[PDB]
PDB file of all heavy atoms in Angstrom:
ATOM      1  N   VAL Z  75      -5.152   5.073 -16.815  1.00  0.00           N
ATOM      2  CA  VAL Z  75      -6.453   5.581 -16.290  1.00  0.00           C
ATOM      3  C   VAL Z  75      -7.535   4.662 -16.914  1.00  0.00           C
ATOM      4  O   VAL Z  75      -7.779   4.678 -18.142  1.00  0.00           O
ATOM      5  CB  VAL Z  75      -6.728   7.021 -16.616  1.00  0.00           C
ATOM      6  CG1 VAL Z  75      -8.140   7.405 -16.198  1.00  0.00           C
ATOM      7  CG2 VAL Z  75      -5.712   7.905 -15.904  1.00  0.00           C
ATOM      8  N   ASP Z  76      -8.208   3.889 -16.069  1.00  0.00           N
ATOM      9  CA  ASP Z  76      -9.364   3.057 -16.473  1.00  0.00           C
ATOM     10  C   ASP Z  76     -10.549   3.546 -15.728  1.00  0.00           C
ATOM     11  O   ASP Z  76     -10.782   3.149 -14.556  1.00  0.00           O
ATOM     12  CB  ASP Z  76      -9.100   1.606 -16.231  1.00  0.00           C
ATOM     13  CG  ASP Z  76      -8.096   0.968 -17.250  1.00  0.00           C
ATOM     14  OD1 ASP Z  76      -8.172   1.348 -18.424  1.00  0.00           O
ATOM     15  OD2 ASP Z  76      -7.374   0.061 -16.868  1.00  0.00           O
ATOM     16  N   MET Z  77     -11.323   4.430 -16.389  1.00  0.00           N
ATOM     17  CA  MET Z  77     -12.457   5.069 -15.704  1.00  0.00           C
ATOM     18  C   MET Z  77     -13.759   4.645 -16.356  1.00  0.00           C
ATOM     19  O   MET Z  77     -13.872   4.754 -17.559  1.00  0.00           O
ATOM     20  CB  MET Z  77     -12.294   6.623 -15.772  1.00  0.00           C
ATOM     21  CG  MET Z  77     -13.120   7.355 -14.762  1.00  0.00           C
ATOM     22  SD  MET Z  77     -12.830   9.151 -14.789  1.00  0.00           S
ATOM     23  CE  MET Z  77     -13.348   9.569 -13.120  1.00  0.00           C
ATOM     24  N   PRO Z  78     -14.777   4.276 -15.572  1.00  0.00           N
ATOM     25  CA  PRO Z  78     -16.102   4.040 -16.140  1.00  0.00           C
ATOM     26  C   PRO Z  78     -16.736   5.356 -16.498  1.00  0.00           C
ATOM     27  O   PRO Z  78     -17.192   6.121 -15.608  1.00  0.00           O
ATOM     28  CB  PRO Z  78     -16.846   3.330 -15.002  1.00  0.00           C
ATOM     29  CG  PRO Z  78     -15.808   2.879 -14.011  1.00  0.00           C
ATOM     30  CD  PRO Z  78     -14.703   3.877 -14.155  1.00  0.00           C
ATOM     31  N   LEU Z  79     -16.802   5.629 -17.814  1.00  0.00           N
ATOM     32  CA  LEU Z  79     -17.140   6.968 -18.256  1.00  0.00           C
ATOM     33  C   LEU Z  79     -18.616   7.228 -18.174  1.00  0.00           C
ATOM     34  O   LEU Z  79     -19.420   6.416 -18.637  1.00  0.00           O
ATOM     35  CB  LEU Z  79     -16.662   7.115 -19.760  1.00  0.00           C
ATOM     36  CG  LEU Z  79     -17.038   8.336 -20.583  1.00  0.00           C
ATOM     37  CD1 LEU Z  79     -16.711   9.622 -19.859  1.00  0.00           C
ATOM     38  CD2 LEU Z  79     -16.257   8.248 -21.873  1.00  0.00           C
ATOM     39  N   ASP Z  80     -18.950   8.359 -17.533  1.00  0.00           N
ATOM     40  CA  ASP Z  80     -20.357   8.713 -17.432  1.00  0.00           C
ATOM     41  C   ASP Z  80     -20.879   9.227 -18.757  1.00  0.00           C
ATOM     42  O   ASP Z  80     -20.098   9.819 -19.542  1.00  0.00           O
ATOM     43  CB  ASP Z  80     -20.534   9.799 -16.357  1.00  0.00           C
ATOM     44  CG  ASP Z  80     -22.014  10.020 -15.968  1.00  0.00           C
ATOM     45  OD1 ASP Z  80     -22.456   9.219 -15.065  1.00  0.00           O
ATOM     46  OD2 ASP Z  80     -22.636  10.897 -16.519  1.00  0.00           O
ATOM     47  N   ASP Z  81     -22.159   9.032 -18.992  1.00  0.00           N
ATOM     48  CA  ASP Z  81     -22.769   9.370 -20.260  1.00  0.00           C
ATOM     49  C   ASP Z  81     -23.045  10.882 -20.362  1.00  0.00           C
ATOM     50  O   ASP Z  81     -22.957  11.459 -21.462  1.00  0.00           O
ATOM     51  CB  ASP Z  81     -24.082   8.648 -20.472  1.00  0.00           C
ATOM     52  CG  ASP Z  81     -23.989   7.187 -20.152  1.00  0.00           C
ATOM     53  OD1 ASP Z  81     -22.881   6.630 -20.416  1.00  0.00           O
ATOM     54  OD2 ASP Z  81     -24.942   6.558 -19.619  1.00  0.00           O
ATOM     55  N   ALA Z  82     -23.246  11.595 -19.231  1.00  0.00           N
ATOM     56  CA  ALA Z  82     -23.382  13.030 -19.243  1.00  0.00           C
ATOM     57  C   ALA Z  82     -22.050  13.782 -19.234  1.00  0.00           C
ATOM     58  O   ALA Z  82     -22.002  14.979 -19.361  1.00  0.00           O
ATOM     59  CB  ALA Z  82     -24.204  13.454 -18.009  1.00  0.00           C
ATOM     60  N   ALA Z  83     -20.897  13.034 -19.157  1.00  0.00           N
ATOM     61  CA  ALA Z  83     -19.616  13.626 -19.159  1.00  0.00           C
ATOM     62  C   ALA Z  83     -19.215  14.022 -20.575  1.00  0.00           C
ATOM     63  O   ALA Z  83     -18.570  13.323 -21.289  1.00  0.00           O
ATOM     64  CB  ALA Z  83     -18.579  12.664 -18.612  1.00  0.00           C
ATOM     65  N   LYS Z  84     -19.706  15.240 -20.983  1.00  0.00           N
ATOM     66  CA  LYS Z  84     -19.446  15.752 -22.324  1.00  0.00           C
ATOM     67  C   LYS Z  84     -17.967  16.132 -22.509  1.00  0.00           C
ATOM     68  O   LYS Z  84     -17.488  16.151 -23.635  1.00  0.00           O
ATOM     69  CB  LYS Z  84     -20.371  16.907 -22.633  1.00  0.00           C
ATOM     70  CG  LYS Z  84     -21.796  16.484 -22.894  1.00  0.00           C
ATOM     71  CD  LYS Z  84     -22.552  17.567 -23.632  1.00  0.00           C
ATOM     72  CE  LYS Z  84     -21.897  17.830 -25.000  1.00  0.00           C
ATOM     73  NZ  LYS Z  84     -21.928  16.574 -25.799  1.00  0.00           N
ATOM     74  N   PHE Z  85     -17.326  16.548 -21.449  1.00  0.00           N
ATOM     75  CA  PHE Z  85     -15.976  17.078 -21.533  1.00  0.00           C
ATOM     76  C   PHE Z  85     -15.098  16.454 -20.411  1.00  0.00           C
ATOM     77  O   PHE Z  85     -15.484  16.492 -19.228  1.00  0.00           O
ATOM     78  CB  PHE Z  85     -15.949  18.625 -21.434  1.00  0.00           C
ATOM     79  CG  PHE Z  85     -16.764  19.238 -22.477  1.00  0.00           C
ATOM     80  CD1 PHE Z  85     -18.082  19.670 -22.232  1.00  0.00           C
ATOM     81  CD2 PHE Z  85     -16.296  19.458 -23.735  1.00  0.00           C
ATOM     82  CE1 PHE Z  85     -18.848  20.300 -23.161  1.00  0.00           C
ATOM     83  CE2 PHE Z  85     -17.043  20.120 -24.761  1.00  0.00           C
ATOM     84  CZ  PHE Z  85     -18.360  20.490 -24.439  1.00  0.00           C
ATOM     85  N   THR Z  86     -13.997  15.887 -20.838  1.00  0.00           N
ATOM     86  CA  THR Z  86     -13.025  15.333 -19.826  1.00  0.00           C
ATOM     87  C   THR Z  86     -12.044  16.437 -19.512  1.00  0.00           C
ATOM     88  O   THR Z  86     -11.146  16.786 -20.353  1.00  0.00           O
ATOM     89  CB  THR Z  86     -12.338  14.147 -20.450  1.00  0.00           C
ATOM     90  OG1 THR Z  86     -13.284  13.132 -20.794  1.00  0.00           O
ATOM     91  CG2 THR Z  86     -11.343  13.514 -19.457  1.00  0.00           C
ATOM     92  N   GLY Z  87     -12.131  16.997 -18.306  1.00  0.00           N
ATOM     93  CA  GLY Z  87     -11.292  18.044 -17.867  1.00  0.00           C
ATOM     94  C   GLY Z  87      -9.975  17.504 -17.291  1.00  0.00           C
ATOM     95  O   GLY Z  87     -10.005  16.717 -16.325  1.00  0.00           O
ATOM     96  N   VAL Z  88      -8.865  17.972 -17.812  1.00  0.00           N
ATOM     97  CA  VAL Z  88      -7.514  17.578 -17.380  1.00  0.00           C
ATOM     98  C   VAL Z  88      -6.783  18.831 -16.982  1.00  0.00           C
ATOM     99  O   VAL Z  88      -6.614  19.749 -17.747  1.00  0.00           O
ATOM    100  CB  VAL Z  88      -6.752  16.849 -18.474  1.00  0.00           C
ATOM    101  CG1 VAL Z  88      -5.317  16.600 -18.060  1.00  0.00           C
ATOM    102  CG2 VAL Z  88      -7.436  15.494 -18.779  1.00  0.00           C
ATOM    103  N   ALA Z  89      -6.416  18.910 -15.644  1.00  0.00           N
ATOM    104  CA  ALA Z  89      -5.679  19.994 -15.126  1.00  0.00           C
ATOM    105  C   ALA Z  89      -4.564  19.496 -14.200  1.00  0.00           C
ATOM    106  O   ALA Z  89      -4.699  18.490 -13.528  1.00  0.00           O
ATOM    107  CB  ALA Z  89      -6.611  21.000 -14.356  1.00  0.00           C
ATOM    108  N   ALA Z  90      -3.478  20.290 -14.145  1.00  0.00           N
ATOM    109  CA  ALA Z  90      -2.300  19.892 -13.384  1.00  0.00           C
ATOM    110  C   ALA Z  90      -1.927  21.045 -12.447  1.00  0.00           C
ATOM    111  O   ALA Z  90      -2.292  22.209 -12.670  1.00  0.00           O
ATOM    112  CB  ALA Z  90      -1.174  19.471 -14.300  1.00  0.00           C
ATOM    113  N   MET Z  91      -1.062  20.752 -11.468  1.00  0.00           N
ATOM    114  CA  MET Z  91      -0.641  21.714 -10.479  1.00  0.00           C
ATOM    115  C   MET Z  91       0.879  21.806 -10.469  1.00  0.00           C
ATOM    116  O   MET Z  91       1.534  21.202  -9.681  1.00  0.00           O
ATOM    117  CB  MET Z  91      -1.168  21.327  -9.085  1.00  0.00           C
ATOM    118  CG  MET Z  91      -2.545  21.738  -8.802  1.00  0.00           C
ATOM    119  SD  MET Z  91      -3.213  20.865  -7.382  1.00  0.00           S
ATOM    120  CE  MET Z  91      -3.543  19.298  -8.170  1.00  0.00           C
ATOM    121  N   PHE Z  92       1.413  22.639 -11.360  1.00  0.00           N
ATOM    122  CA  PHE Z  92       2.858  22.826 -11.402  1.00  0.00           C
ATOM    123  C   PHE Z  92       3.265  23.809 -10.370  1.00  0.00           C
ATOM    124  O   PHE Z  92       2.463  24.500  -9.742  1.00  0.00           O
ATOM    125  CB  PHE Z  92       3.255  23.266 -12.819  1.00  0.00           C
ATOM    126  CG  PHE Z  92       2.786  22.341 -13.910  1.00  0.00           C
ATOM    127  CD1 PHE Z  92       1.681  22.703 -14.697  1.00  0.00           C
ATOM    128  CD2 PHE Z  92       3.498  21.196 -14.176  1.00  0.00           C
ATOM    129  CE1 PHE Z  92       1.268  21.857 -15.688  1.00  0.00           C
ATOM    130  CE2 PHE Z  92       3.081  20.374 -15.209  1.00  0.00           C
ATOM    131  CZ  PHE Z  92       1.963  20.709 -15.940  1.00  0.00           C
ATOM    132  N   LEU Z  93       4.618  23.944 -10.154  1.00  0.00           N
ATOM    133  CA  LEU Z  93       5.155  25.041  -9.356  1.00  0.00           C
ATOM    134  C   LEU Z  93       4.945  26.394 -10.039  1.00  0.00           C
ATOM    135  O   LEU Z  93       4.707  27.387  -9.341  1.00  0.00           O
ATOM    136  CB  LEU Z  93       6.646  24.812  -9.066  1.00  0.00           C
ATOM    137  CG  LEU Z  93       7.014  24.324  -7.653  1.00  0.00           C
ATOM    138  CD1 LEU Z  93       8.514  24.342  -7.525  1.00  0.00           C
ATOM    139  CD2 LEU Z  93       6.386  25.190  -6.599  1.00  0.00           C
ATOM    140  N   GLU Z  94       5.051  26.389 -11.362  1.00  0.00           N
ATOM    141  CA  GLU Z  94       4.928  27.636 -12.143  1.00  0.00           C
ATOM    142  C   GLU Z  94       3.834  27.444 -13.217  1.00  0.00           C
ATOM    143  O   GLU Z  94       4.163  27.302 -14.374  1.00  0.00           O
ATOM    144  CB  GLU Z  94       6.293  27.999 -12.783  1.00  0.00           C
ATOM    145  CG  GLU Z  94       6.372  29.400 -13.220  1.00  0.00           C
ATOM    146  CD  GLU Z  94       7.704  29.688 -13.941  1.00  0.00           C
ATOM    147  OE1 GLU Z  94       8.463  28.738 -14.101  1.00  0.00           O
ATOM    148  OE2 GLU Z  94       7.918  30.860 -14.302  1.00  0.00           O
ATOM    149  N   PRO Z  95       2.545  27.524 -12.793  1.00  0.00           N
ATOM    150  CA  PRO Z  95       1.529  27.322 -13.807  1.00  0.00           C
ATOM    151  C   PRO Z  95       1.265  28.638 -14.578  1.00  0.00           C
ATOM    152  O   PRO Z  95       0.898  29.663 -14.030  1.00  0.00           O
ATOM    153  CB  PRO Z  95       0.255  26.980 -12.984  1.00  0.00           C
ATOM    154  CG  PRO Z  95       0.520  27.544 -11.637  1.00  0.00           C
ATOM    155  CD  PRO Z  95       2.046  27.798 -11.463  1.00  0.00           C
ATOM    156  N   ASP Z  96       1.581  28.578 -15.879  1.00  0.00           N
ATOM    157  CA  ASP Z  96       1.382  29.741 -16.753  1.00  0.00           C
ATOM    158  C   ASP Z  96      -0.105  29.951 -16.962  1.00  0.00           C
ATOM    159  O   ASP Z  96      -0.690  29.341 -17.907  1.00  0.00           O
ATOM    160  CB  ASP Z  96       2.117  29.565 -18.078  1.00  0.00           C
ATOM    161  CG  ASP Z  96       2.293  30.880 -18.809  1.00  0.00           C
ATOM    162  OD1 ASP Z  96       1.830  31.916 -18.288  1.00  0.00           O
ATOM    163  OD2 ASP Z  96       2.885  30.879 -19.922  1.00  0.00           O
TER     164      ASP Z  96
END
Side-chain angles (χ1 to χ4, degrees):
Chain Z
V75 174
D76 283 327
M77 200 175 203
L79 172 52
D80 195 85
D81 314 326
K84 286 199 62 58
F85 303 96
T86 301
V88 171
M91 276 164 285
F92 305 101
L93 255 188
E94 197 183 4
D96 197 1

